[PDB]
Amino acid sequence: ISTSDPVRQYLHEIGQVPLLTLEEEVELARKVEEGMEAIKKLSEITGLDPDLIREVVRAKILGSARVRHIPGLKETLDPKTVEEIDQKLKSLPKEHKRYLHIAREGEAARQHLIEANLRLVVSIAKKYTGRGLSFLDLIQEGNQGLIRAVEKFEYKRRFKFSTYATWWIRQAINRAIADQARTIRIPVHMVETINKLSRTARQLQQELGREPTYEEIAEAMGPGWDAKRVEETLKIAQEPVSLETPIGDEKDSFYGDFIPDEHLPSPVDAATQSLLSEELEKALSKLSEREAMVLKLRKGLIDGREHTLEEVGAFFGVTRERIRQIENKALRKLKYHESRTRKLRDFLD
Amino acid sequence: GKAQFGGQRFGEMEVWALEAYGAAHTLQEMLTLKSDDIEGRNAAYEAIIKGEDVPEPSVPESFRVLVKELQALALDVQTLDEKDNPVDIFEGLASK
Amino acid sequence: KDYECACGKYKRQRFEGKVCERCGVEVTKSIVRRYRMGHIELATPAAHIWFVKDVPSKIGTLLDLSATELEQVLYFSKYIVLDPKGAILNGVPVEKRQLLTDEEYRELRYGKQETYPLPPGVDALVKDGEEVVKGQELAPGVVSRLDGVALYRFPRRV
Amino acid sequence: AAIDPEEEVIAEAEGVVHLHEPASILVVKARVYPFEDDVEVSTGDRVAPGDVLADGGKVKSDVYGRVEVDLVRNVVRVVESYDIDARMGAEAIQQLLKELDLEALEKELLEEMKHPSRARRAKARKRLEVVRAFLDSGNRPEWMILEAVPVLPPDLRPMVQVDGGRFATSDLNDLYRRLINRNNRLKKLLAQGAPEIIIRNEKRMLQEAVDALLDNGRRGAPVTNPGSDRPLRSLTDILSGKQGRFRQNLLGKRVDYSGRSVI
RNA sequence: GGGGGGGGGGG
DNA sequence: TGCATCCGTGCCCTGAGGGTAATAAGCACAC
DNA sequence: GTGTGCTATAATGGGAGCTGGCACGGATGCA
Ligand SMILES: [Mg+2]
Ligand SMILES: [Zn+2]
């Protein structure tokens, strides 16, 4: 019955669709190509978007189960519109009915081919284990590559299907591994750079008989590489650690039990800031109301924005020269008060 | 730990001893003003260095952590008053 | 960062709650990162495991389903019927809330049919489109297992 | 026909054509109907006895089945198969849960409560307890099926730069990453109209991903960090146990203004 | 029906 | 009623250790 | 620098079973 163990279930399911003989494969590919040509013909005839007719025929052949919005279609996909399109296509004369029949058969042929060629995906994916992704994820990405290969396969060239399908399955698996295997994402070109660098380091360790220094690696990489670039690449390729890992050999003490919180201010720091605000208010209360307002509007103690001299002068209705002079004399008073009282020295940190 | 300049652990048994002594305010200090009550501990330090008495303790941060983690498990935990009307412990930051 | 947008256009409390157009980040305290939740919109509903594997299962008890049956349905091992649509299986009409295995569901939904390969050079006894009963010999080495119409797939010779 | 213009078989003159030596023979439990004029129904459509098939209503179907139009043979086949409504997994479970009438079930369980037998009475009692809890609580049963998973705030699963320059992460980020990956892949596979096996496997692994996110190791093997055997820490394992939230951070704490020394 | 376990010291 | 299987529990605080781990082609346009 | 496409001998069911030293209570199937 295979309770749990999804891989056994997947294998037993894919083992129920029979393998294809060559003539059946050729006929299915011919049906798919003819159906695509028929869809193009219907697009020309009815003057509609080929993807629309394609999705309508696919929905009809699949059944009422799968209805949902298509990213490419501009109109929303609902049963009303698909019934409208089905009735519009069922109103055409006798001659064009054969095109609709061929398209409806080609969709089923495509489904049968995609179902038939899944164990090839499984066999290609079985060699990618251990690179950060689980087996079933690789299987599904290979299945997507297989679907694309089924779309792109041309049977006129007399080549077997697996020959063209393997390329797409392999490329899909590699792209998925390069895109999704890391917690912090690295672009695919940089991933290829990391892999090439690791390969070069492995080779140089093999010949040299010891782990090479950065300069030897950079020399082996060729032009454009120096030791600093190799060190930077190695620094880039590092994977984070989990806070829930046991540091020693315990199972109760972990890595996060020793990481401090540097963001939120400590009580000492918050108290220092509060005392600084209170002392600044007390010192400014030794000034006049207007000259305190001037500096508060200039520094950001009021409303939090640093106002220009023109803005404060307009607010007080005075000349920018007058606002500058009163600001300067207020700052002189502040300097005198701090020199006489010494209440802000220790707050310079 | 000594190396991290940390503090002593007031475990379950110490809380049981405090409860058996009937010392409610000392226990409430241990649970809030001396750990994971940010506003409470900041105001307590300010009041002490100003010579005043420490203020009223507030909701611990670990209770908010527990509430959010339970909301992550698709469970709705609500704090209710005597009339069963909702009372917010996040002062509106977590509510749109 | 407290009271500061991502792009740095709004960097203090003079805006509080205002949403930056460039980065889309609301200007509030940083501690809101401890409280605000998100969500993931699944394309297929999923059962909460607490109400499935906590004996006795609450969903199973409500639906009068045993643990094995609920496990088989939830993790895709058997079907469950919501509307019989007048179907009948092995002479017994299908009743609602019955469990069908994949072969039974397929023979109900898409019909039953089989494909018999013939050895090379051996000609078919029956002709194309001819009705055939179970056990009737379609080829010297082929014995039919179901009564139904027989069709040619690929004739080598014209 | 052939791929190339040559090797095509064009009739020399008037005659008849016969086909011999099939590669294989398919036996299908179906009803055949020849037709002359235009056919009303295309392939894949399902018909009921009496539904019009072709010839503008002259020929009609006698059996519930699926229409298979063979244009080569100019024949409409009806493969005997029904439109039975059967579903799988949490979608079917939720559909069933939305159709429950708790009052009628309460009445039925109250009737069963009076049966003489011990076991039947006890089972009815348990079921009625659950039903009455749902009734009085005001919680719809279908809410036990999730349609939109909630996402914990980042600061409770932080991505923090350690002093040495490295990064430290929580396992919850990995579980959420797996969930999002599988959900997006499901959406893409649905957009492409993939066969049912692929969609079924994807839905099953999505269910397993949600199960691991909620309670890792409850069913099957726990998900582990690549190249390691240490299970990831789900939401369930943080709340329970000696190292859980309750006992470690709520029933006991670490306090300020404290010291220690030898006595 | 098919794979277990947190090292050593102090009190 | 008597067996069989699965899940849940198993003392408290503190110190020092010191943690990072076996890889499949790339190249061409585009912005 | 990063995101995306594609390529044409033929290839068509993984990982091997890294195995066994806690023990008792309870709760439900299953006789
Ligand atoms: Mg060099
Ligand atoms: Zn911004």
From Swiss-Prot, chain B:
Highest taxon of the lineage: Bacteria
Coiled coil: none
Function according to Swiss-Prot or TrEMBL: DNA-dependent RNA polymerase catalyzes the transcription of DNA into RNA using the four ribonucleoside triphosphates as substrates.
Binding partners and assembly: The RNAP catalytic core consists of 2 alpha, 1 beta, 1 beta' and 1 omega subunit. When a sigma factor is associated with the core the holoenzyme is formed, which can initiate transcription.
Family the entry assigns: Belongs to the RNA polymerase beta chain family.
Protein name: DNA-directed RNA polymerase subunit beta
Curated annotation (Swiss-Prot), chain C:
Membrane spanning stretches: none
Binding site for Zn(2+) 1: 5, 7, 20, 23
Chain coiled-coil ranges: none
Assembly and interaction partners: The RNAP catalytic core consists of 2 alpha, 1 beta, 1 beta' and 1 omega subunit. When a sigma factor is associated with the core the holoenzyme is formed, which can initiate transcription.
Protein task: DNA-dependent RNA polymerase catalyzes the transcription of DNA into RNA using the four ribonucleoside triphosphates as substrates.
Family under the similarity heading: Belongs to the RNA polymerase beta' chain family.
Name of this protein: DNA-directed RNA polymerase subunit beta'
Naturally occurring in which organism (per UniProt): Thermus thermophilus (strain ATCC 27634 / DSM 579 / HB8)
Organismal lineage: Bacteria, Thermotogati, Deinococcota, Deinococci, Thermales
Curated annotation (Swiss-Prot), chain D:
Domain of life from the UniProt record: Bacteria
Protein family per UniProt: Belongs to the RNA polymerase beta' chain family.
Assembly with partners or alone: The RNAP catalytic core consists of 2 alpha, 1 beta, 1 beta' and 1 omega subunit. When a sigma factor is associated with the core the holoenzyme is formed, which can initiate transcription.
Described function: DNA-dependent RNA polymerase catalyzes the transcription of DNA into RNA using the four ribonucleoside triphosphates as substrates.
The protein, known as: DNA-directed RNA polymerase subunit beta'
Organism of origin: Thermus thermophilus (strain ATCC 27634 / DSM 579 / HB8)
Upper taxonomic lineage: Bacteria, Thermotogati, Deinococcota, Deinococci, Thermales
Portion of the full sequence shown: 369 to 631 of 1524
